[PDB]
Every structure is written in structure tokens, then in C-alpha cells.
């Protein structure tokens, strides 16, 4: 998949950083000529960073302005020669909030392998969940487990209600069913037909009982499996796709953070 596709697909999700009045990024100096860029999914993180700047530099703390851009042009600049703009140790990194990475790691270790370290930026998805359009059913990607499960609860309620009224549909069909079975179980002379038709009744109602078992066990089945991944990896996979994974990635797109809530 060419880079223009991902530049169009990653646009809805923003990210906050800080620039100068000269429209220049702020960085953190270290040892032996190192600097690095940052991108905070919640602007309060950069605001706290420059509140720490005010702790040691009042000039730079007055010289700040808060910028909000999508991942569009930062991914663009990732796909560029970094030494064209000047690079001898400037490593742009991301900085996710600790809330969602903690939810991510609890997801991680409620699977069976308990660790306390993470790679990338935490993305969430749900099994069975896919937003359908007038034409196709695209997959929405949630950086926020809250928004994820707010969509998932609506979808779960509507589907399990569809299932309860589906079993009411089969309740209609089966009140009609026992009607014929009862209409000759003892209404005529018994023998062949009584045996055959009450074996038919056993058939029908043992099947419909296992059916309702399935229907409500679907609700007694757990929350559809929620998965967490790294934004770094899903993006570098989106970029280097061709063939089957092409049609796979071509229908996944990312929702805005804290959009589904309010």
C-alpha cells in the first residue's frame, strides 16, 4: 500500500505537541549530541512538560505554543530523509498516556503471559466488531478502551436483542410446529403416526432447547475478545502491504480519541 493511502487513513486521529513562534519543534538535549521529538496523545502531557520547563527555564516556557496535528504530516516526515532537515541523533518518539497502556498490559497479562512492559502505542479492537457502511463493513480502531467498549456495548445490546427476538421468531414458528404434531398425536388412531410424530416432537423441542441454550449462552459467553497492539507496528505493517494483506488493511481505519464518549 502506497504512502498516500495511509496518509489519508490516519488523518482523523490527531496528536498534540508544542512548537515555537518560529514554528519549530521543541526537543530535549542529552549527552553526546542527542535530541528527540515527542508527540503526546493527550495535550496535558506536553503542557506538564513545559510546566517542568518553567521549573528551569522561564524564557522557553513563555516561548511555547500548543500545536495539534494529525498523524498525517508526522508520518510524512517519518517517510523522508531525516538528515535533509538536520539529523545527527534526533529520534522522534511517541508518548502514550499511562492509563491506556495500563489497560493494555492488563489485557496482555489476562491472557496468560504476565509482564509489565509494552511496545508501541496501545491500540484496541474487538472480535466481531466492524462498522458497516452503505457499501462495506470497515473495521474501526480504538486507541481508547472506554470508547471501544462504549461502541461494543451498543453493538452487543443490539445483537443480543436481535437474538432474543430471533428466538421469539422461532417461538412463533414452533408454536405452529407443535400445532401440527399435536393435531395428530392423539387426534386420530394411534400406532405408526403417534410414534413418528412424538419422536418428531422430541426432535423439535430437544433441538429448540439446545437452541435457546446457544442463544442465551451467547450472552453468558464472555465479552467478545478484545485485542491490543502497537501503533508503531500496525503502521509499519500498513505501509509494507501488498496482496492479501492489502485487502485486509484496506478496510481498517482509526476512530478519533474520546470521540464516541461525547
Amino acid at each position: 500500500m502506497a504512502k498516500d493511502e495511509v496518509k489519508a487513513r490516519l488523518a482523523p486521529v490527531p496528536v498534540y505537541t508544542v512548537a515555537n513562534p518560529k514554528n519549530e519543534f521543541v526537543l530535549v538535549a542529552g549527552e553526546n549530541n542527542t535530541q528527540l521529538g515527542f508527540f503526546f496523545f493527550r495535550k496535558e502531557d506536553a503542557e506538564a512538560l513545559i510546566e517542568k520547563i518553567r521549573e528551569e527555564n522561564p524564557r522557553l516556557a513563555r516561548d511555547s505554543k500548543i500545536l495539534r496535528v494529525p498523524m498525517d504530516n508526522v508520518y510524512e516526515v517519518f517517510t523522508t530523509p531525516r538528515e535533509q532537515t538536520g539529523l545527527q541523533g534526533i529520534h522522534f518518539r511517541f508518548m502514550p498516556d499511562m492509563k491506556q497502556v495500563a489497560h493494555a498490559l492488563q489485557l496482555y497479562k489476562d491472557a496468560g503471559v504476565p509482564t509489565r512492559q509494552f511496545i508501541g502505542v496501545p491500540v484496541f479492537q474487538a472480535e466481531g466488531l466492524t462498522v458497516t457502511t452503505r457499501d462495506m463493513q470497515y473495521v474501526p480502531l480504538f486507541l481508547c478502551k472506554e470508547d471501544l467498549d462504549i461502541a461494543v456495548q451498543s453493538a452487543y445490546v443490539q445483537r443480543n436483542a436481535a437474538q432474543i427476538k430471533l428466538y421469539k421468531d422461532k417461538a412463533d414458528k414452533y408454536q405452529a410446529d407443535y400445532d401440527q404434531i399435536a393435531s395428530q398425536l392423539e387426534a386420530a388412531a394411534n400406532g405408526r403416526e403417534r410414534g413418528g410424530l412424538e419422536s418428531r416432537l422430541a426432535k423439535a423441542r430437544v433441538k429448540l432447547e439446545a437452541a435457546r441454550d446457544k442463544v442465551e449462552s451467547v450472552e453468558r459467553a464472555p465479552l467478545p475478545k478484545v485485542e491490543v497492539g502497537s501503533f508503531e507496528e500496525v503502521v509499519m505493517r500498513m505501509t509494507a502491504s501488498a496482496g492479501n494483506e492489502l485487502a485486509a488493511w484496506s478496510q481498517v481505519m482509526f476512530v478519533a480519541p474520546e470521540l464516541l464518549r461525547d
Binding site: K3, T79, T80, P81, E233, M236, R237, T239, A240, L246
Partner: protein, 157 residues
């Protein structure tokens, strides 16, 4: 101004190969317009053999793989048989060398190719409220009417 495009091309190529090697290492650890044209002044097979006459291929690469993979009555018009005949004659004359001037029988195909391509895969419903029957000279009307009626009557039998 082709080098601008090819600078962007080098950007894309370096990023592509770097990310490919990166994800190769990654998933292994997880487990364990300037250039839009084409020509053919000589049949591909002929000069391919003439060149490979000097090269020892340790392994075949992707483009030649595609070529040898594509190597293996709806066209029975006499024009098409004449076409294939001239094809073979011109190939023979092409590789026979190895007015005082010869002009070919066919033309060389200088070709452009499209860019920004995709994946390989009555009546009317007007109605009046109430018809106005024409109510609100006529002797001739009645006359011609019954006259035609009795004419038909006599012409029945």
C-alpha cells in the same frame, strides 16, 4: 527536472527496504513525465541469449522468473497467418547478420503506458379532476351516422 522525482523515489525505496528488513527481523524474533515509455529494437529472446552467452546465473531473479513463467481457431483469419509469417521472417532477418540501405517491413513500437492505474483485480401521470363531456348542425351528424350504419347493414350479407 527528473531528479526531483527520483529523489522522492530514492526516499521511498530506502524506506521500503529498511522497513522490510526491520519487519523481517521483527517477525523472526516473534517466532524464534520522464520514464513512461517502452521500445523493442530487437526481440527479447534473441538479445537475451546473445547476452547470457557471457553470464553464469547462480540463481534466476524475479523478472526473468516472470518471463519464463509467461513463456508457456479464434485467430484463424488469413491476415493473422500472414502476420505470423512476417513475424518469423523479420526475426530471422533480425538475427541473420550474426540502394545500400534497407527499410523494415514492420515498424518499431515506441510505446507510452498509463500511470495512476489500479489493482490487477416511461410515462406521465397527469390527470384532470372531472372530464368535460362536450355538453352545454347536429342533423347532418345524425344523418351521416345512421347512413353509415345502414350501409354497413346492407353490406353485411
Amino acid at each position: 527536472n527528473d531528479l526531483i522525482s527520483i529523489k522522492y523515489c530514492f526516499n521511498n525505496l530506502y524506506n521500503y527496504i529498511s522497513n522490510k528488513t526491520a519487519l523481517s527481523t521483527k517477525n523472526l524474533f516473534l517466532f524464534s513525465l520522464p520514464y513512461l515509455k517502452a521500445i523493442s529494437p530487437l526481440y527479447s529472446k534473441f538479445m537475451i541469449d546473445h547476452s547470457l552467452k557471457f553470464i553464469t546465473p547462480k540463481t534466476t531473479l524475479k523478472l526473468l522468473q516472470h518471463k519464463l513463467n509467461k513463456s508457456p481457431h479464434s485467430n484463424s483469419r488469413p491476415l493473422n497467418h500472414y502476420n505470423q509469417a512476417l513475424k518469423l521472417i523479420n526475426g530471422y532477418e533480425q538475427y541473420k547478420n550474426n540502394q545500400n540501405i534497407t527499410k523494415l517491413k514492420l515498424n518499431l513500437t515506441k510505446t507510452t503506458v498509463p500511470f495512476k492505474t489500479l489493482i490487477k483485480k416511461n410515462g406521465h401521470l397527469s390527470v384532470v379532476s372531472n372530464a368535460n363531456l362536450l355538453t352545454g348542425k347536429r342533423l347532418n351528424s345524425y344523418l351521416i351516422y345512421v347512413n353509415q350504419n345502414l350501409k354497413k347493414f346492407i353490406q353485411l350479407n
